[PDB]
Enzyme design. Structure first.
Site, PDB file in Angstrom:
ATOM      1  N   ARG A  53       0.834  -1.186   0.000  1.00 28.31           N
ATOM      2  CA  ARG A  53       0.000   0.000   0.000  1.00 28.31           C
ATOM      3  C   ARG A  53       0.868   1.234   0.000  1.00 28.31           C
ATOM      4  O   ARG A  53       1.836   1.297   0.717  1.00 28.31           O
ATOM      5  CB  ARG A  53      -0.959   0.007   1.207  1.00 28.31           C
ATOM      6  CG  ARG A  53      -2.023  -1.100   1.154  1.00 28.31           C
ATOM      7  CD  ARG A  53      -3.022  -1.052   2.313  1.00 28.31           C
ATOM      8  NE  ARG A  53      -3.748   0.219   2.333  1.00 28.31           N
ATOM      9  CZ  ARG A  53      -4.831   0.509   1.597  1.00 28.31           C
ATOM     10  NH1 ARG A  53      -5.378  -0.383   0.764  1.00 28.31           N
ATOM     11  NH2 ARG A  53      -5.379   1.718   1.693  1.00 28.31           N
ATOM     12  N   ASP A  99      17.048  10.035 -13.547  1.00 31.72           N
ATOM     13  CA  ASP A  99      16.472   9.513 -12.311  1.00 31.72           C
ATOM     14  C   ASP A  99      15.351   8.502 -12.593  1.00 31.72           C
ATOM     15  O   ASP A  99      14.195   8.795 -12.397  1.00 31.72           O
ATOM     16  CB  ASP A  99      15.977  10.731 -11.508  1.00 31.72           C
ATOM     17  CG  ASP A  99      15.404  10.370 -10.154  1.00 31.72           C
ATOM     18  OD1 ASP A  99      15.582   9.215  -9.682  1.00 31.72           O
ATOM     19  OD2 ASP A  99      14.797  11.281  -9.535  1.00 31.72           O
ATOM     20  N   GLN A 119      29.506 -13.333 -21.720  1.00 31.73           N
ATOM     21  CA  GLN A 119      28.756 -14.452 -22.275  1.00 31.73           C
ATOM     22  C   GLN A 119      29.641 -15.639 -22.643  1.00 31.73           C
ATOM     23  O   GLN A 119      29.131 -16.631 -23.128  1.00 31.73           O
ATOM     24  CB  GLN A 119      27.918 -13.998 -23.466  1.00 31.73           C
ATOM     25  CG  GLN A 119      26.890 -12.967 -23.034  1.00 31.73           C
ATOM     26  CD  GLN A 119      25.947 -12.545 -24.140  1.00 31.73           C
ATOM     27  OE1 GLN A 119      26.037 -11.413 -24.651  1.00 31.73           O
ATOM     28  NE2 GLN A 119      25.011 -13.436 -24.498  1.00 31.73           N
ATOM     29  N   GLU A 138      11.538   2.905  -5.874  1.00 34.94           N
ATOM     30  CA  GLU A 138      12.460   3.717  -5.079  1.00 34.94           C
ATOM     31  C   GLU A 138      11.781   4.997  -4.601  1.00 34.94           C
ATOM     32  O   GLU A 138      12.008   5.414  -3.469  1.00 34.94           O
ATOM     33  CB  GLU A 138      13.706   4.089  -5.893  1.00 34.94           C
ATOM     34  CG  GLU A 138      14.785   4.820  -5.118  1.00 34.94           C
ATOM     35  CD  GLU A 138      14.862   6.332  -5.341  1.00 34.94           C
ATOM     36  OE1 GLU A 138      13.976   6.969  -5.983  1.00 34.94           O
ATOM     37  OE2 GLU A 138      15.872   6.899  -4.882  1.00 34.94           O
ATOM     38  N   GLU A 139      10.990   5.630  -5.479  1.00 37.05           N
ATOM     39  CA  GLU A 139      10.451   6.974  -5.213  1.00 37.05           C
ATOM     40  C   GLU A 139       9.272   6.951  -4.262  1.00 37.05           C
ATOM     41  O   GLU A 139       8.435   6.022  -4.300  1.00 37.05           O
ATOM     42  CB  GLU A 139      10.058   7.725  -6.492  1.00 37.05           C
ATOM     43  CG  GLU A 139      11.221   7.895  -7.506  1.00 37.05           C
ATOM     44  CD  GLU A 139      12.123   9.069  -7.266  1.00 37.05           C
ATOM     45  OE1 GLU A 139      12.087   9.662  -6.148  1.00 37.05           O
ATOM     46  OE2 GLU A 139      12.880   9.387  -8.204  1.00 37.05           O
ATOM     47  N   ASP A 180      22.598   6.304  -9.534  1.00 34.66           N
ATOM     48  CA  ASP A 180      21.406   7.153  -9.463  1.00 34.66           C
ATOM     49  C   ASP A 180      21.822   8.571  -9.890  1.00 34.66           C
ATOM     50  O   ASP A 180      22.965   9.020  -9.629  1.00 34.66           O
ATOM     51  CB  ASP A 180      20.869   7.140  -8.031  1.00 34.66           C
ATOM     52  CG  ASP A 180      19.436   7.676  -7.878  1.00 34.66           C
ATOM     53  OD1 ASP A 180      18.821   8.109  -8.847  1.00 34.66           O
ATOM     54  OD2 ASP A 180      18.909   7.642  -6.720  1.00 34.66           O
ATOM     55  N   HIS A 259      13.860  16.220 -10.046  1.00 33.52           N
ATOM     56  CA  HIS A 259      12.477  16.193  -9.641  1.00 33.52           C
ATOM     57  C   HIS A 259      11.627  17.330 -10.207  1.00 33.52           C
ATOM     58  O   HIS A 259      10.757  17.818  -9.521  1.00 33.52           O
ATOM     59  CB  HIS A 259      12.343  16.077  -8.128  1.00 33.52           C
ATOM     60  CG  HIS A 259      12.624  14.695  -7.590  1.00 33.52           C
ATOM     61  ND1 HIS A 259      12.366  14.342  -6.318  1.00 33.52           N
ATOM     62  CD2 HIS A 259      13.149  13.572  -8.205  1.00 33.52           C
ATOM     63  CE1 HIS A 259      12.687  13.044  -6.142  1.00 33.52           C
ATOM     64  NE2 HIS A 259      13.177  12.583  -7.290  1.00 33.52           N
ATOM     65  N   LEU A 268      19.862  15.958 -20.920  1.00 29.52           N
ATOM     66  CA  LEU A 268      21.020  15.037 -20.847  1.00 29.52           C
ATOM     67  C   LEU A 268      22.235  15.613 -21.548  1.00 29.52           C
ATOM     68  O   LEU A 268      22.114  16.397 -22.501  1.00 29.52           O
ATOM     69  CB  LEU A 268      20.684  13.683 -21.463  1.00 29.52           C
ATOM     70  CG  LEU A 268      19.547  12.974 -20.719  1.00 29.52           C
ATOM     71  CD1 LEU A 268      19.147  11.671 -21.370  1.00 29.52           C
ATOM     72  CD2 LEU A 268      19.980  12.737 -19.260  1.00 29.52           C
TER      73      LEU A 268
HETATM   74 ZN   LIG Z   1      14.030  10.821  -7.801  1.00 25.21          ZN
END
Ligand SMILES: [Zn+2]
Ligand SMILES: *[C@@H]1O[C@H](CO)[C@@H](O[C@@H]2O[C@H](CO)[C@@H](O[C@@H]3O[C@H](CO)[C@@H](O)[C@H](O)[C@@H]3O)[C@H](O)[C@H]2NC(C)=O)[C@H](O)[C@H]1NC(C)=O
EC number: 2.3.2.5
Length: 299
Positions: A53, A99, A119, A138-139, A180, A259, A268
Protein backbone atom coordinates in the site's frame (compact mmCIF):
# COMPACT_ATOMS: atom_id res chain seq x y z
CA UNK A 1 39.86 -2.60 -25.91
CA UNK A 2 36.20 -2.31 -24.72
CA UNK A 3 34.49 -0.14 -27.29
CA UNK A 4 31.42 2.11 -27.06
CA UNK A 5 28.05 0.90 -28.36
CA UNK A 6 26.03 4.10 -28.36
CA UNK A 7 23.54 2.62 -30.86
CA UNK A 8 22.59 0.08 -28.24
CA UNK A 9 22.71 2.69 -25.47
CA UNK A 10 20.35 5.10 -27.33
CA UNK A 11 17.99 2.33 -28.26
CA UNK A 12 17.87 0.99 -24.68
CA UNK A 13 17.35 4.49 -23.27
CA UNK A 14 14.51 5.21 -25.76
CA UNK A 15 12.72 2.14 -24.49
CA UNK A 16 13.11 2.99 -20.81
CA UNK A 17 12.51 6.76 -21.11
CA UNK A 18 8.71 6.82 -20.83
CA UNK A 19 6.46 7.59 -17.86
CA UNK A 20 6.54 4.55 -15.63
CA UNK A 21 4.94 5.17 -12.27
CA UNK A 22 4.29 2.09 -10.15
CA UNK A 23 0.74 0.93 -10.91
CA UNK A 24 0.71 2.36 -14.44
CA UNK A 25 0.46 0.54 -17.70
CA UNK A 26 3.66 2.18 -18.93
CA UNK A 27 5.49 0.76 -15.89
CA UNK A 28 4.41 -2.75 -16.83
CA UNK A 29 5.81 -2.21 -20.36
CA UNK A 30 9.16 -1.08 -18.97
CA UNK A 31 9.28 -4.05 -16.56
CA UNK A 32 8.63 -6.46 -19.47
CA UNK A 33 11.24 -4.64 -21.51
CA UNK A 34 13.83 -5.02 -18.72
CA UNK A 35 13.12 -8.84 -18.49
CA UNK A 36 13.39 -9.24 -22.25
CA UNK A 37 16.59 -7.20 -22.46
CA UNK A 38 18.27 -9.19 -19.64
CA UNK A 39 17.32 -12.51 -21.21
CA UNK A 40 18.69 -11.22 -24.50
CA UNK A 41 22.03 -10.26 -22.94
CA UNK A 42 22.56 -13.73 -21.39
CA UNK A 43 21.26 -13.23 -17.85
CA UNK A 44 19.17 -15.61 -15.85
CA UNK A 45 16.27 -13.32 -15.00
CA UNK A 46 13.94 -13.37 -12.03
CA UNK A 47 11.26 -11.03 -10.82
CA UNK A 48 10.54 -10.19 -7.15
CA UNK A 49 6.83 -9.23 -7.38
CA UNK A 50 4.74 -8.14 -4.41
CA UNK A 51 1.79 -5.94 -3.41
CA UNK A 52 2.04 -3.04 -0.96
CA UNK A 53 0.00 0.00 0.00
CA UNK A 54 1.18 3.51 -0.84
CA UNK A 55 -0.21 6.90 0.06
CA UNK A 56 -3.17 8.09 -2.04
CA UNK A 57 -3.44 5.06 -4.30
CA UNK A 58 -3.54 2.17 -1.82
CA UNK A 59 -2.35 -1.26 -2.90
CA UNK A 60 -0.03 -1.41 -5.93
CA UNK A 61 1.97 -4.19 -7.53
CA UNK A 62 5.77 -3.72 -7.35
CA UNK A 63 8.34 -5.84 -9.20
CA UNK A 64 12.11 -5.79 -8.77
CA UNK A 65 13.84 -7.18 -11.87
CA UNK A 66 17.09 -9.09 -11.27
CA UNK A 67 19.45 -10.53 -13.84
CA UNK A 68 22.25 -12.91 -12.83
CA UNK A 69 25.21 -14.45 -14.68
CA UNK A 70 26.70 -17.46 -12.74
CA UNK A 71 23.81 -17.90 -10.25
CA UNK A 72 25.76 -20.64 -8.45
CA UNK A 73 28.87 -18.51 -7.83
CA UNK A 74 30.11 -18.12 -4.30
CA UNK A 75 30.10 -14.31 -4.47
CA UNK A 76 28.56 -11.51 -6.58
CA UNK A 77 29.26 -8.03 -7.87
CA UNK A 78 25.82 -6.35 -7.73
CA UNK A 79 25.13 -3.31 -9.97
CA UNK A 80 21.83 -1.45 -9.49
CA UNK A 81 19.43 1.34 -10.39
CA UNK A 82 15.68 2.13 -9.90
CA UNK A 83 13.35 1.80 -12.87
CA UNK A 84 10.18 3.44 -11.50
CA UNK A 85 9.53 7.11 -12.30
CA UNK A 86 8.41 9.30 -9.40
CA UNK A 87 4.67 9.99 -8.93
CA UNK A 88 4.04 13.72 -9.11
CA UNK A 89 0.49 15.14 -8.56
CA UNK A 90 1.25 17.83 -11.14
CA UNK A 91 3.37 15.80 -13.62
CA UNK A 92 2.10 12.39 -14.72
CA UNK A 93 4.42 12.57 -17.75
CA UNK A 94 7.69 12.83 -15.72
CA UNK A 95 10.26 10.69 -17.53
CA UNK A 96 13.09 10.81 -14.89
CA UNK A 97 15.83 10.85 -17.53
CA UNK A 98 18.71 11.01 -15.01
CA UNK A 99 16.47 9.51 -12.31
CA UNK A 100 17.01 6.86 -13.37
CA UNK A 101 16.41 5.99 -17.05
CA UNK A 102 20.04 6.67 -17.90
CA UNK A 103 21.36 4.64 -14.93
CA UNK A 104 19.24 1.60 -15.96
CA UNK A 105 20.31 1.99 -19.60
CA UNK A 106 23.95 2.21 -18.42
CA UNK A 107 23.56 -1.18 -16.67
CA UNK A 108 22.16 -2.85 -19.83
CA UNK A 109 24.75 -1.18 -22.08
CA UNK A 110 27.58 -2.30 -19.76
CA UNK A 111 26.33 -5.90 -20.22
CA UNK A 112 26.28 -5.28 -23.99
CA UNK A 113 29.70 -3.69 -24.35
CA UNK A 114 31.35 -6.35 -22.13
CA UNK A 115 29.25 -9.07 -23.80
CA UNK A 116 32.18 -10.84 -25.50
CA UNK A 117 33.56 -11.51 -22.00
CA UNK A 118 30.39 -11.98 -19.93
CA UNK A 119 28.76 -14.45 -22.28
CA UNK A 120 31.89 -16.63 -22.68
CA UNK A 121 35.07 -16.70 -20.51
CA UNK A 122 33.15 -15.22 -17.56
CA UNK A 123 30.78 -18.24 -17.50
CA UNK A 124 33.74 -20.62 -16.85
CA UNK A 125 34.11 -19.99 -13.14
CA UNK A 126 32.47 -20.45 -9.73
CA UNK A 127 34.15 -17.76 -7.63
CA UNK A 128 32.11 -14.70 -8.79
CA UNK A 129 28.88 -13.87 -10.55
CA UNK A 130 27.26 -10.63 -11.81
CA UNK A 131 23.91 -9.28 -10.75
CA UNK A 132 22.05 -6.41 -12.44
CA UNK A 133 19.29 -5.21 -10.10
CA UNK A 134 16.51 -2.94 -11.26
CA UNK A 135 14.77 -1.84 -8.09
CA UNK A 136 11.12 -0.90 -8.26
CA UNK A 137 9.42 1.84 -6.29
CA UNK A 138 12.46 3.72 -5.08
CA UNK A 139 10.45 6.97 -5.21
CA UNK A 140 8.12 8.19 -2.49
CA UNK A 141 4.44 8.93 -3.34
CA UNK A 142 3.82 11.63 -0.70
CA UNK A 143 6.74 12.62 1.44
CA UNK A 144 10.01 10.63 1.58
CA UNK A 145 9.93 8.86 4.95
CA UNK A 146 10.91 5.53 6.40
CA UNK A 147 7.52 4.17 5.30
CA UNK A 148 7.17 5.89 1.92
CA UNK A 149 10.32 5.21 -0.16
CA UNK A 150 12.58 2.36 -1.33
CA UNK A 151 9.66 -0.12 -1.46
CA UNK A 152 11.35 -2.52 -3.85
CA UNK A 153 14.81 -2.49 -2.29
CA UNK A 154 13.35 -3.00 1.22
CA UNK A 155 11.56 -6.04 -0.11
CA UNK A 156 14.48 -7.50 -2.10
CA UNK A 157 16.89 -7.02 0.78
CA UNK A 158 14.48 -8.81 3.21
CA UNK A 159 14.13 -11.58 0.71
CA UNK A 160 17.88 -12.07 0.10
CA UNK A 161 18.46 -11.77 3.86
CA UNK A 162 15.94 -14.53 4.79
CA UNK A 163 21.05 -23.46 7.51
CA UNK A 164 21.16 -21.32 10.72
CA UNK A 165 24.91 -20.53 10.55
CA UNK A 166 25.22 -20.59 6.74
CA UNK A 167 25.61 -17.42 4.70
CA UNK A 168 22.38 -15.72 3.70
CA UNK A 169 22.11 -15.02 -0.02
CA UNK A 170 22.57 -11.31 0.71
CA UNK A 171 25.94 -12.00 2.42
CA UNK A 172 27.18 -13.31 -0.92
CA UNK A 173 27.10 -9.66 -2.29
CA UNK A 174 30.64 -8.33 -2.06
CA UNK A 175 29.42 -4.81 -2.90
CA UNK A 176 26.26 -3.12 -4.10
CA UNK A 177 27.17 -0.52 -6.72
CA UNK A 178 24.14 1.77 -6.93
CA UNK A 179 23.85 4.25 -9.81
CA UNK A 180 21.41 7.15 -9.46
CA UNK A 181 21.06 10.67 -10.93
CA UNK A 182 23.43 10.22 -13.88
CA UNK A 183 23.15 11.89 -17.28
CA UNK A 184 23.54 15.59 -16.48
CA UNK A 185 26.53 17.63 -17.55
CA UNK A 186 29.75 17.17 -15.58
CA UNK A 187 28.67 14.89 -12.68
CA UNK A 188 30.94 14.68 -9.61
CA UNK A 189 31.20 11.42 -7.57
CA UNK A 190 32.59 11.40 -4.03
CA UNK A 191 33.19 8.36 -1.74
CA UNK A 192 30.38 7.86 0.79
CA UNK A 193 31.80 4.81 2.69
CA UNK A 194 35.29 4.19 4.05
CA UNK A 195 35.06 0.46 3.36
CA UNK A 196 34.56 1.07 -0.40
CA UNK A 197 37.16 3.85 -0.71
CA UNK A 198 39.39 1.28 -2.51
CA UNK A 199 36.73 0.76 -5.20
CA UNK A 200 36.09 4.51 -5.49
CA UNK A 201 39.86 5.01 -5.91
CA UNK A 202 39.86 2.41 -8.69
CA UNK A 203 37.25 4.51 -10.61
CA UNK A 204 39.46 7.58 -10.03
CA UNK A 205 42.53 5.76 -11.40
CA UNK A 206 40.70 4.16 -14.32
CA UNK A 207 39.37 7.60 -15.28
CA UNK A 208 42.94 9.00 -15.09
CA UNK A 209 44.13 6.15 -17.39
CA UNK A 210 41.40 6.67 -19.93
CA UNK A 211 41.94 10.44 -19.84
CA UNK A 212 45.72 10.14 -20.24
CA UNK A 213 45.19 7.76 -23.19
CA UNK A 214 42.98 10.34 -24.92
CA UNK A 215 39.82 8.26 -24.69
CA UNK A 216 37.56 10.71 -22.73
CA UNK A 217 35.77 13.85 -23.97
CA UNK A 218 36.84 17.11 -22.34
CA UNK A 219 38.88 17.85 -19.26
CA UNK A 220 36.32 17.61 -16.42
CA UNK A 221 37.12 15.16 -13.55
CA UNK A 222 34.10 12.98 -12.81
CA UNK A 223 35.40 10.69 -10.00
CA UNK A 224 36.80 12.73 -7.13
CA UNK A 225 39.33 11.74 -4.47
CA UNK A 226 37.29 13.04 -1.62
CA UNK A 227 34.92 11.80 1.02
CA UNK A 228 31.30 12.91 0.93
CA UNK A 229 29.90 15.60 3.26
CA UNK A 230 26.25 15.06 2.40
CA UNK A 231 23.70 12.36 3.06
CA UNK A 232 21.70 10.71 0.29
CA UNK A 233 19.01 8.22 1.26
CA UNK A 234 18.43 5.75 -1.51
CA UNK A 235 17.90 2.11 -2.45
CA UNK A 236 21.24 1.09 -0.83
CA UNK A 237 19.96 1.81 2.69
CA UNK A 238 18.17 -1.55 3.19
CA UNK A 239 21.40 -3.28 2.03
CA UNK A 240 23.58 -1.22 4.26
CA UNK A 241 21.28 -2.26 7.19
CA UNK A 242 22.06 -5.89 6.36
CA UNK A 243 25.79 -5.10 6.39
CA UNK A 244 26.26 -5.12 2.52
CA UNK A 245 29.11 -2.83 1.45
CA UNK A 246 27.92 -0.02 -0.81
CA UNK A 247 29.49 2.10 -3.52
CA UNK A 248 26.88 4.84 -4.09
CA UNK A 249 27.41 6.34 -7.57
CA UNK A 250 25.01 9.31 -7.22
CA UNK A 251 26.15 12.65 -8.67
CA UNK A 252 26.54 15.42 -6.08
CA UNK A 253 25.48 18.05 -6.90
CA UNK A 254 22.26 16.60 -8.21
CA UNK A 255 21.29 17.49 -11.79
CA UNK A 256 19.82 21.03 -11.94
CA UNK A 257 16.57 19.44 -13.23
CA UNK A 258 16.10 16.99 -10.35
CA UNK A 259 12.48 16.19 -9.64
CA UNK A 260 11.12 18.66 -12.21
CA UNK A 261 9.51 18.01 -15.61
CA UNK A 262 12.75 19.16 -17.21
CA UNK A 263 14.54 15.88 -16.15
CA UNK A 264 14.16 14.82 -19.78
CA UNK A 265 16.16 13.82 -22.81
CA UNK A 266 16.79 17.47 -23.83
CA UNK A 267 18.71 18.11 -20.61
CA UNK A 268 21.02 15.04 -20.85
CA UNK A 269 24.68 15.61 -21.65
CA UNK A 270 25.87 12.90 -23.95
CA UNK A 271 29.61 13.49 -23.56
CA UNK A 272 29.22 13.04 -19.78
CA UNK A 273 27.22 9.85 -20.29
CA UNK A 274 29.84 8.50 -22.72
CA UNK A 275 32.68 9.29 -20.30
CA UNK A 276 30.82 7.65 -17.39
CA UNK A 277 30.25 4.57 -19.53
CA UNK A 278 33.89 4.29 -20.54
CA UNK A 279 35.11 4.41 -16.94
CA UNK A 280 32.30 2.25 -15.61
CA UNK A 281 32.48 -0.60 -18.17
CA UNK A 282 36.24 -0.89 -17.43
CA UNK A 283 35.68 -0.80 -13.66
CA UNK A 284 33.17 -3.67 -13.97
CA UNK A 285 35.48 -5.66 -16.28
CA UNK A 286 38.54 -5.20 -14.09
CA UNK A 287 36.58 -6.11 -10.89
CA UNK A 288 35.38 -9.38 -12.44
CA UNK A 289 38.60 -10.25 -14.42
CA UNK A 290 40.88 -9.67 -11.40
CA UNK A 291 38.56 -11.39 -8.87
CA UNK A 292 40.27 -14.41 -7.35
CA UNK A 293 39.34 -14.84 -3.69
CA UNK A 294 36.12 -13.60 -1.92
CA UNK A 295 36.29 -9.85 -1.57
CA UNK A 296 35.97 -8.62 2.02
CA UNK A 297 34.82 -5.08 2.52
CA UNK A 298 32.71 -5.79 5.64
CA UNK A 299 35.29 -6.81 8.25
ZN1 LIG B 1 14.03 10.82 -7.80
C1 LIG C 1 22.50 8.94 -29.55
O1 LIG C 1 21.67 9.99 -29.16
C2 LIG C 1 22.23 11.28 -29.11
C3 LIG C 1 21.14 12.28 -28.71
O2 LIG C 1 20.18 12.41 -29.72
C4 LIG C 1 22.84 11.70 -30.45
O3 LIG C 1 23.52 12.90 -30.15
C5 LIG C 1 23.47 13.87 -31.20
O4 LIG C 1 24.44 13.56 -32.18
C6 LIG C 1 24.36 14.44 -33.30
C7 LIG C 1 25.26 13.95 -34.44
O5 LIG C 1 26.58 13.83 -33.96
C8 LIG C 1 24.69 15.87 -32.86
O6 LIG C 1 24.55 16.72 -33.97
C9 LIG C 1 25.43 17.86 -33.91
O7 LIG C 1 24.76 19.06 -33.60
C10 LIG C 1 25.68 20.11 -33.30
C11 LIG C 1 24.94 21.40 -32.91
O8 LIG C 1 23.97 21.18 -31.90
C12 LIG C 1 26.63 20.38 -34.47
O9 LIG C 1 27.71 21.11 -33.94
C13 LIG C 1 27.17 19.13 -35.17
O10 LIG C 1 27.63 19.44 -36.48
C14 LIG C 1 26.12 18.03 -35.26
O11 LIG C 1 25.15 18.40 -36.22
C15 LIG C 1 23.78 16.32 -31.71
O12 LIG C 1 24.20 17.56 -31.15
C16 LIG C 1 23.73 15.25 -30.61
N1 LIG C 1 22.68 15.61 -29.70
C17 LIG C 1 22.88 15.72 -28.39
C18 LIG C 1 21.69 16.09 -27.54
O13 LIG C 1 23.99 15.49 -27.90
C19 LIG C 1 23.82 10.63 -30.89
O14 LIG C 1 24.38 10.84 -32.16
C20 LIG C 1 23.13 9.27 -30.89
N2 LIG C 1 24.12 8.29 -31.26
C21 LIG C 1 23.93 7.28 -32.08
C22 LIG C 1 22.57 7.11 -32.65
O15 LIG C 1 24.86 6.49 -32.31
Amino acid sequence: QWRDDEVHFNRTLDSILVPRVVGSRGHQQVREYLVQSLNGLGFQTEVDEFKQRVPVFGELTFANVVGTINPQAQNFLALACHYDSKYFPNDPGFVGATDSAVPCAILLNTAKTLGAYLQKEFRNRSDVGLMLIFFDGEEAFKEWTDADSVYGSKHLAAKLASAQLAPRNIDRIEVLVLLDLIGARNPKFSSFYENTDGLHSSLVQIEKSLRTAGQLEGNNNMFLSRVSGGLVDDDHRPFLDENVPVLHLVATPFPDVWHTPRDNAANLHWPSIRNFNRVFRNFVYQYLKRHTSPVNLRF
